Amino acid sequence: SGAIYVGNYRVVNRHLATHNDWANLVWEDSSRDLLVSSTTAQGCDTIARCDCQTGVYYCSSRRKHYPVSFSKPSLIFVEASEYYPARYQSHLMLAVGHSEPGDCGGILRCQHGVVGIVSTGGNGLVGFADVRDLLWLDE
Ligand SMILES: CSc1ccccc1CC(=O)N1CCC[C@](F)(C(N)=O)C1
Ligand SMILES: [Zn+2]
């Protein structure tokens, strides 16, 4: 679990979105596993606008933050689930690090601010859904 709160927006993994998220829907993209909903309070997370390939993520299954090197956003195939058939997930970055189902939603940050949220993993790998291209989150 976990979300990004920026301005009047809440960004979450689409497979974990609530009834409230869907009732207050701004935008969603199944291929990115992202959903954005509107909020009543002002969010203060800063979104990074960069091409960093290093950062720190929060890993709930370890109650710890870990430093990581991560790949550039790309199409990476993925397997099924209560959520989505076999498929390519776009705007996805991979890193060598611990993740288990339950870690989805943990924030990845670089010196510039929020980069994305944990989405996918397994085998000593962890994936992050990038949010740095969603320029509209700021305005
Ligand atoms: C951190 S998730 C993880 C980690 C280790 C092992 C397994 C998982 C689970 C996982 O990869 N998925 C199930 C939930 C939806 C999913 F995140 C997606 N974006 O399609 C795929
Ligand atoms: Zn950065």
Curated annotation (Swiss-Prot):
<feature type="active site" description="For protease 2A activity">
    <location>
        <position position="15"/>
    </location>
</feature>
<feature type="binding site">
    <location>
        <position position="112"/>
    </location>
    <ligand>
        <name>Zn(2+) 1</name>
    </ligand>
</feature>
<feature type="active site" description="For protease 2A activity">
    <location>
        <position position="33"/>
    </location>
</feature>
<protein>
    <recommendedName>
        <fullName>Protease 2A</fullName>
    </recommendedName>
</protein>
<comment type="subunit">
    <text>Homodimer.</text>
</comment>
<feature type="binding site">
    <location>
        <position position="50"/>
    </location>
    <ligand>
        <name>Zn(2+) 1</name>
    </ligand>
</feature>
<feature type="binding site">
    <location>
        <position position="52"/>
    </location>
    <ligand>
        <name>Zn(2+) 1</name>
    </ligand>
</feature>
<feature type="active site" description="For protease 2A activity">
    <location>
        <position position="104"/>
    </location>
</feature>
<comment type="function">
    <text>Cysteine protease that cleaves viral polyprotein and specific host proteins. It is responsible for the autocatalytic cleavage between the P1 and P2 regions, which is the first cleavage occurring in the polyprotein. Also cleaves the host translation initiation factor EIF4G1, in order to shut down the capped cellular mRNA translation. Inhibits the host nucleus-cytoplasm protein and RNA trafficking by cleaving host members of the nuclear pores. Counteracts stress granule formation probably by antagonizing its assembly or promoting its dissassembly.</text>
</comment>
<feature type="binding site">
    <location>
        <position position="110"/>
    </location>
    <ligand>
        <name>Zn(2+) 1</name>
    </ligand>
</feature>
